[PDB]
């Protein structure tokens, strides 16, 4: 039974200094309204999401605090960070590899991210090969869960995600950033990728399309995209079960 006590995720939302200039145009308010809104469309996506196709809905998520990160962050030689100004391994690279960009941005934000239910990074930068966002999960997501770092020297959580609003050197539309946080939401729920295999999960574009938790970002005019497969369903379903007691709130 859903407990309306424990029916949200609340969120930490961090926008980096790429984020701020080129989606928030160097401005506080453009940039938590962007934010602001795009949670609330995903969240409607969740909260009408029938998890059993029966009564288990209502569940979603709710920003806690937005940090917004102004200007680059300044590091000693040798030194990294999440939002400093270059991109790292590549230096020469508008963007991060991705993997190493959500392991940076889990390490920096350790002490906050063991306070809320998940911690997403929104940025803007061009991962090669098309890639829109990452996040752990679906081993992580929703709830802290500690991961001692060897390299890191201390504990870090993997309730964190990211999203990039930049593809191919253009600023995504906005039907198609809120896919990607959906998606990586998702993968923080519990869902892994919908299988080519399985004609319910992945059907064809005259069947409504694929649903969000398919592999490759497909357009986002066909009626699938923005809902979550039976696939999608199954694994949330067990995540939330198990995790909305140990660190879902009430909704505000
Ligand atoms: C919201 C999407 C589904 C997220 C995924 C990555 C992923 O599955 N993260 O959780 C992605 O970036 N997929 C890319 C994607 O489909 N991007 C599109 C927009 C694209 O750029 N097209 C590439 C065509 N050669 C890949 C990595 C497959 C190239
Ligand atoms: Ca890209
Ligand atoms: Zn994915």
Known sequence: DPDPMKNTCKLLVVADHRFYRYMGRGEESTTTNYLIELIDRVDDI???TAWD????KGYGIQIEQIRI??????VKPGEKHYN???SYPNEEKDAWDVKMLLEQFSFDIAEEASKVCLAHLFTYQDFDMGTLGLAYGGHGGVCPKAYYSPVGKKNIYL???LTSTKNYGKTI????????????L???????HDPDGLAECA???DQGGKYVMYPIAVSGDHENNKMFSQCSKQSIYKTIESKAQECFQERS
């Open 46 to 48: 969740y909260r009408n």
């Open 53 to 56: 196709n029966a009564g288990f």
């Open 69 to 74: 990160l102004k200007s680059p962050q300044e």
């Open 84 to 86: 400093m100004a270059k």
């Open 159 to 161: 309730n964190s995600g």
């Open 173 to 184: 539309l906005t039907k198609e950033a809120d896919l990607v946080t959906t998606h990586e």
């Open 186 to 192: 998702g993968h923080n729920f519990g869902a892994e």
């Open 203 to 205: 059907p064809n574009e």
